[model samples]
Target: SLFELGKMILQETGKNPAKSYGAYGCNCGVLGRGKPKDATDRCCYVHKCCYKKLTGCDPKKDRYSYSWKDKTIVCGENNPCLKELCECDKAVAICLRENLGTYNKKYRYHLKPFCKKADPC
Candidate 1:
């Protein structure tokens, strides 16, 4: 119903207690990666966008894709065993427990899309 929907919208963005409304903001980042120190971009709130903007690689060229939900660049591979990269939201890589892996970390950063391995490149 229009009445219910309107109420829902107001509650989502009205910020009025009488109307039981609420507004929100974002603070998405990683080690201060996506968010700036001040967070005064468009809405004067914190949000995540520039991780993709400041990234040094792309999914096709560097074999990596930026996942907004995870807020990190997924690594890719050029193995000849499969059709393409796995493109998983998260994948295991060969790295020290105290360190993060690199985009082109030898043959470990490869993915398998669904349920396969990219083999060794």
Candidate 2:
């Protein structure tokens, strides 16, 4: 259960999910795309998220603003949130910002696929 997982994150990383859900603080493993769901389904369905970050985290430096055309974050070396986050995790985040910081925060929890560069989804 993520109750236990949450506790571990707090104890180890001193991060509170209530504050920044982004700080998962662990790299138990990395799934291809939808595998986080299996772990979440096995554990905390609520906090257990399939968070494939929108653009990627590299050049974005965590600042992800979406593009209106393709509906995906404007991909750029200076604008990669998920990839940056994944680089840190060597995978992806435990909970990711959906749609690369959507046009609205009302839908940040929207789990999206890890989009490859030079592609449209």
Candidate 3:
């Protein structure tokens, strides 16, 4: 049972199932790709799984969107709205937007992996 599994994980790992599982099984470990801040940063299983379920692609892959394609706000070095649109928890999304500022400057386009309504990563 899911309930029983949760209790067993808590007893053995001393952490919640959500935190202990999820990315632990994936390549997005503490210092993996996307360059997360620290070990505490993590991609939610629900969010990552949801992204994959909808996109038919691994959330870890790099996805791009030209600037002319989407007009969402781009996260910069010290933007306050970063925590809102840019999900620091999801590594792929962070990587998706990585170098976007430079890309926009050089190519006049936006490159991102997921969309808000379509890809919530």
Candidate 4:
């Protein structure tokens, strides 16, 4: 239930034991490139909306807290191969969920959503 589950997520996040961003705030970026994995923007959309509602998360600042790592554990023809990215995605998710609650929540700077990666956003 979104009820008790909410509480658990909240306490874990240190936010009054209520539905909080800690649980769902995992900023797992571009998991599977939103392709073949059958996961469209909906995956990130819901996560973002829910997190915002919970902790007023700002993408600008919150995103910075993310740590980019490339062990290249996975392999694909592309630079950021599908398998490698997938491994890192989970790592990102764990980091986000763990750090989001404690985030200072500062979004003084902003940039266009890496639209450069994809064609025309």
lDDT of 1: 0.22
> Taking the tens digit of each residue's C-alpha lDDT, what string does model 1 give over 1-121?
1232222223333323112211111111112221211211111111112112323333223333222234332333344211122221122111111122121122221121221221121
TM-score computed on alpha carbons, candidate 2: 0.23
lDDT tens readout by residue for model 2, 1-121: 2333333334333446334333111212222222222322112222223233343323223433222234322323343444343232311222232212321332224243431221111
Worst 10 residues of 3 by lDDT: 106-115
Tell me the number of clashing residue pairs for each predicted model.
4, 13, 4, 1
**Residue 19 CA error for candidate 4 (Å)?**
17
Candidate 1 scores a C-alpha RMSD against the true structure in Å of 20.0
Better of 3 and 4 by TM-score: 4
Cα lDDT, all candidates: 0.22, 0.29, 0.30, 0.30
Q: What would you estimate as the lDDT of candidate 3?
A: 0.30
User: Is 2 or 4 the stronger prediction by lDDT?
Assistant: 4
TM-scores, all candidates, are: 0.14, 0.23, 0.21, 0.24
**Cα misplacement distance, residue 67 of candidate 3 (Å):** 56
Q: What is the lDDT of residue 74 in candidate 2?
A: 30
Off by over 4 Å in 4: 1-80, 108-121
Ranking by TM-score: 4, 2, 3, 1
lDDT string, candidate 3, 4-98, tens digits: 32333343334554454323322222212232222222232233433434333223332322111143223232332222222322233333234
